[PDB]
Design a binder for this molecule. Sequence first.
Ligand SMILES: NC(=O)c1ccc[n+]([C@@H]2O[C@H](COP(=O)([O-])OP(=O)(O)OC[C@H]3O[C@@H](n4cnc5c(N)ncnc54)[C@H](OP(=O)(O)O)[C@@H]3O)[C@@H](O)[C@H]2O)c1
Ligand SMILES: NC(=O)c1ccc[n+]([C@@H]2O[C@H](COP(=O)([O-])OP(=O)(O)OC[C@H]3O[C@@H](n4cnc5c(N)ncnc54)[C@H](OP(=O)(O)O)[C@@H]3O)[C@@H](O)[C@H]2O)c1
Ligand SMILES: NC(=O)c1ccc[n+]([C@@H]2O[C@H](COP(=O)([O-])OP(=O)(O)OC[C@H]3O[C@@H](n4cnc5c(N)ncnc54)[C@H](OP(=O)(O)O)[C@@H]3O)[C@@H](O)[C@H]2O)c1
Ligand SMILES: NC(=O)c1ccc[n+]([C@@H]2O[C@H](COP(=O)([O-])OP(=O)(O)OC[C@H]3O[C@@H](n4cnc5c(N)ncnc54)[C@H](OP(=O)(O)O)[C@@H]3O)[C@@H](O)[C@H]2O)c1
Ligand SMILES: *CC(=O)N[C@H](CC#C)C(=O)N1CCC(COc2cccc3nc(N)nc(N)c23)CC1
Ligand SMILES: *CC(=O)N[C@H](CC#C)C(=O)N1CCC(COc2cccc3nc(N)nc(N)c23)CC1
Ligand SMILES: *CC(=O)N[C@H](CC#C)C(=O)N1CCC(COc2cccc3nc(N)nc(N)c23)CC1
Ligand SMILES: *CC(=O)N[C@H](CC#C)C(=O)N1CCC(COc2cccc3nc(N)nc(N)c23)CC1
Lengths: 249, 250, 250, 251
Amino acid sequence: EAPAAVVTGAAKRIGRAIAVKLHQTGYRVVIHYHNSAEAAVSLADELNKERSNTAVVCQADLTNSNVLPASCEEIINSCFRAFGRCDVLVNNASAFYPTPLVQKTVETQVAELIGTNAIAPFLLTMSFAQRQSNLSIVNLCDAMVDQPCMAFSLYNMGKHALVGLTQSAALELAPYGIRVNGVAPGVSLLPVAMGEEEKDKWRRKVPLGRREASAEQIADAVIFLVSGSAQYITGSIIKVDGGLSLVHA
Amino acid sequence: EAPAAVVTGAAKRIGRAIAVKLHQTGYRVVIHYHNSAEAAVSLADELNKERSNTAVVCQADLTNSNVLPASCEEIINSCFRAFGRCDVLVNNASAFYPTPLVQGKTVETQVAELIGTNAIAPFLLTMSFAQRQSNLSIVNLCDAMVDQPCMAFSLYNMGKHALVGLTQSAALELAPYGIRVNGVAPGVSLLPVAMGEEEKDKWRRKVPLGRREASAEQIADAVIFLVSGSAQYITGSIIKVDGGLSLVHA
Amino acid sequence: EAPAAVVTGAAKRIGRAIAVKLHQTGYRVVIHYHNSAEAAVSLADELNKERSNTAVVCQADLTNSNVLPASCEEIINSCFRAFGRCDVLVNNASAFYPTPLVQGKTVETQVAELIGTNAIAPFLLTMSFAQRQSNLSIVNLCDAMVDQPCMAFSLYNMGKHALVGLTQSAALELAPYGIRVNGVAPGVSLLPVAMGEEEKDKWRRKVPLGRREASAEQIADAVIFLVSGSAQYITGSIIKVDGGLSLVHA
Amino acid sequence: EAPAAVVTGAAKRIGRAIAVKLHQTGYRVVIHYHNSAEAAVSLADELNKERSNTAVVCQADLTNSNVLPASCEEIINSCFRAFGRCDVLVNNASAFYPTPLVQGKTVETQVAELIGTNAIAPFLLTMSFAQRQKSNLSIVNLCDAMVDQPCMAFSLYNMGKHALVGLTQSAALELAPYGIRVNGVAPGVSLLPVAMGEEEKDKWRRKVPLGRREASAEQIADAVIFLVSGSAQYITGSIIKVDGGLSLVHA
Ligand SMILES: NC(=O)c1ccc[n+]([C@@H]2O[C@H](COP(=O)([O-])OP(=O)(O)OC[C@H]3O[C@@H](n4cnc5c(N)ncnc54)[C@H](OP(=O)(O)O)[C@@H]3O)[C@@H](O)[C@H]2O)c1
Ligand SMILES: NC(=O)c1ccc[n+]([C@@H]2O[C@H](COP(=O)([O-])OP(=O)(O)OC[C@H]3O[C@@H](n4cnc5c(N)ncnc54)[C@H](OP(=O)(O)O)[C@@H]3O)[C@@H](O)[C@H]2O)c1
Ligand SMILES: NC(=O)c1ccc[n+]([C@@H]2O[C@H](COP(=O)([O-])OP(=O)(O)OC[C@H]3O[C@@H](n4cnc5c(N)ncnc54)[C@H](OP(=O)(O)O)[C@@H]3O)[C@@H](O)[C@H]2O)c1
Ligand SMILES: NC(=O)c1ccc[n+]([C@@H]2O[C@H](COP(=O)([O-])OP(=O)(O)OC[C@H]3O[C@@H](n4cnc5c(N)ncnc54)[C@H](OP(=O)(O)O)[C@@H]3O)[C@@H](O)[C@H]2O)c1
Ligand SMILES: *CC(=O)N[C@H](CC#C)C(=O)N1CCC(COc2cccc3nc(N)nc(N)c23)CC1
Ligand SMILES: *CC(=O)N[C@H](CC#C)C(=O)N1CCC(COc2cccc3nc(N)nc(N)c23)CC1
Ligand SMILES: *CC(=O)N[C@H](CC#C)C(=O)N1CCC(COc2cccc3nc(N)nc(N)c23)CC1
Ligand SMILES: *CC(=O)N[C@H](CC#C)C(=O)N1CCC(COc2cccc3nc(N)nc(N)c23)CC1
């Protein structure tokens, strides 16, 4: 019987590449999305064309709210409903934008940035564990958490909280044989809205090849961590950053 | 004219020792409290008896909510109203209790209290402190054991990790304004009032330096250092005051 | 056509498992050894029986001395002599024993062996590897417990900390040459042959994930990942393979 | 009776400021030096003019060698011989220069100097310090805030500073039962090299978030004073960055 995986924010970019590579490795996949319905379904169609009834989609807002716990339980439930099991959770979905300390409401920014990057991963982790082989969770972290971008304090707080969850959950779920690890990109796929001149500025800072990581290169580290080659690995965060985090000002 | 400081959760325990030591150093203090009204007022009375018009209390819930930004703004405003200035912010108030991943507060409430008090309220207080602006600084009460967490304390731990992030992010962003942002990270300090002596001794005996918990005063000493002129080039730093506990393997 | 790898201290235990797994992946291997001549030759025989002309041995003391640079150059040279190329360096060889700060090897010798094997020899091998230059990479065997050190192992610990520094420094400096530099950091893996069973069990039961030590093969798996095309964007990274041990408080 | 401190490399720059501030705090001081005899003696004369019989000098090469253990024992011994006690050790002396991985000191000499001064000599001094105790005893190691964002081609220097972090932590743990605390102070940009042109100095200064300037030697010394004080009696194994936020700045 084929294992099954949930990937949050899987319709595009890094999450899409993760879903594709898990599917290629033999997983059935839940493609979670928020706004990207068309791209989510398009991906599921591609995967189901390769192997029938191996991909489903699942819609949810992961902003923090009174309903978030129910939404996260339903994401996990969607995997059990479609595939009868849930072996892997990848927490990939993430809101990302500046929140300057000195001059959406700030309460909404808190809900979106801390909800997507930290609280929803926590609630999904709870629901994943409650419903339980090579079981594991992979959190998409950020190699630059300790050298943060100016005016991104709430985003950064969210990613730091995710490191804490990764470590806390590794410890607490180890007795259940659930491993919990992270993958920490530096510069990967740049924002669609960023101008080419700015993209090049960031690319040229990367020591290894002066370019961003492809989505597939991020996905490769995820595949490693969920594999039998990582069966003793828990609580670990692998940087996939081409040396960027080691570069001084 | 005397500088002024806000200390959150200052009615008791470590926050009280911090407020007392800042007061002894010449600061006027806002004693923030949530439920500990009697202890807060009693402390302000003691400090004002020592020097008139040098302490006020300020009540606020720092649970996450849509009104938390306004509450945090009002804490800072309370310092300006009492003293005409706000030089130092100490983020000390903190909810602390287990939230097991596997099995009667709702999880919505646990998130709001643990992430609100330990991370979001510090962020909003930091915003308000900075907006309203000399030796200006913020000191966050962190946790030396954030990377060796207590079993079943994931939300608390997430909160303290987020506070590290804030410490670093805010140091960077507020450096141009001359505001320093640092942390003090206890290991074992004052044990919970409800904990039995047998358990207290179990944790005390794990500490390499002296096999005892830190006094509240020892924590406060590190805060006093970081707000002083002796730390004027220090920002983004988190000083462990843990007697070596974080270095001890399983 | 086949790439080639040097593995230091490869005659036994973790280094042997690394050499075997690299060989199984298609590498030709130099089996470096110091005292374990019989085991090194036996391993080369086993690998060459599987595929002819794919393994040689190379003897060297990696204690620090004025001749260590020449010895390390000769290890790399041995790879070029046997295989015409050198694609991968695994710095595995390591002296490990206590050096109490407060009280028949001299301290001069303890320094030379512990700092030589764990740090200086890796540095010199890295220099020689780089000078003599595709998927080129170095993997250093680090230690997940470097910040929760064993009592009385200060020189060993200093050595492993230095190796972290080298991993990061060399990643940065060799990135323009397309050489990646990464580490694998065990917690409890293969226990010392000389350790009593009662002590072995004490350490095993501290590991959160499965209450057992890592097999040599599990360590090797992380090395195989880091040298593979699946890690082509990874440099300066140290992967813990410790079953959660480093996260456990005292 | 006044406590006593050893400060290595104390004739100039940061070590000098540390020795001065310890002296001002009431310590008697051993001023260790290697080549800077005239500056060491000049400092001792200034301190003894302030308070008689409160400063001596002690000469030693801290390069790694067969004699280094004996040299480090003798440094500690010189404190006991002058002052009858040794309360504080500050490991400050440090060689600093590039050692590129890819291309007239030999590399074995570079190893001996960079690893000796930054790591091995601190270890041996720590051993000797602890052996002679066998009251507020503490060691402060001068570390480096930028150890995880290293300067290109400074691999041996960086290895040395990483080793010193290890020592700080290992020694804190092992000496805690004796009541000896072990901590570090980690500068970012402090006193720039004497040779450096103002244009290059300003390049590095302008990277510092807090004030766009290097730390004074006195600012570094202030952190040392804190760590040896009664205000840090529960602090051990801690490394305080004094870097104006530099270590938090991305590329
Ligand atoms: N790209 C980089 O360079 C980089 C660098 C460091 C770390 N990372 C991390 O790597 C991961 C993937 O990065 P990425 O660039 O591929 O991400 P992204 O494109 O910014 O976000 C991925 C998806 O997150 C979903 N998401 C956002 N807000 C949401 C909400 N309120 N509720 C539910 N889902 C929500 C969106 O799904 P819909 O489109 O369906 O609305 C979006 O497509 C993230 O965790 C990121 O922080 C990336
Ligand atoms: N004690 C230790 O061993 C230790 C260890 C590591 C870190 N620390 C950190 O050091 C700091 C002080 O520790 P502590 O033991 O003195 O703290 P504490 O006694 O547990 O709590 C401090 C105060 O926080 C306030 N607080 C709690 N929930 C609040 C809410 N919803 N809104 C507003 N205020 C709220 C309470 O004020 P009221 O009483 O007024 O309701 C309480 O007296 C904390 O940040 C803690 O995490 C302490
Ligand atoms: N085992 C664990 O639990 C563990 C934990 C943390 C980290 N690690 C790291 O993982 C690596 C492998 O561990 P291990 O237990 O397999 O190692 P080990 O058995 O303790 O040592 C590996 C080899 O190092 C060689 N070596 C020692 N002194 C040498 C010298 N002066 N010159 C040259 N080679 C020398 C020896 O080779 P000969 O036999 O040929 O004399 C020895 O066989 C090491 O770097 C270790 O620090 C292991
Ligand atoms: N300056 C900075 O920006 C900076 C930045 C980060 C960290 N730090 C650390 O802070 C400390 C002080 O820095 P600094 O710039 O003041 O130091 P420095 O001037 O480069 O060196 C201080 C002293 O070290 C001594 N020393 C060098 N090689 C020696 C050897 N072989 N044996 C014995 N002593 C030797 C020299 O003594 P003699 O003059 O008597 O020969 C020298 O005056 C160092 O540990 C340094 O790594 C400094
Ligand atoms: C200030 C800045 O952009 N660059 C620094 C590092 C340097 C040099 C930095 O903080 N970085 C971290 C974030 C990276 C970009 O990221 C993302 C890019 C695009 C989408 C995206 N989505 C989500 N959800 N999260 C993130 N982090 C990103 C660039 C380097
Ligand atoms: C499971 C556990 O306690 N583990 C270690 C104990 C040891 C040794 C640990 O992880 N520690 C972290 C938490 C410390 C205790 O704390 C507090 C104690 C009392 C009140 C309190 N209030 C608040 N707000 N926060 C905290 N952290 C604490 C003990 C060491
Ligand atoms: C004091 C102690 O061992 N404490 C923990 C043990 C636990 C839990 C610890 O610090 N660990 C580090 C040392 C590990 C053992 O290691 C080795 C074991 C066998 C051989 C060996 N060779 C070499 N070269 N290096 C090392 N590190 C080891 C156990 C976990
Ligand atoms: C390449 C580089 O310098 N990069 C940054 C500078 C910036 C921003 C860096 O890595 N830093 C570390 C080294 C600092 C300079 O230092 C010294 C300067 C002068 C003397 C000296 N002596 C000794 N013994 N050690 C050191 N480290 C220094 C600059 C910041």
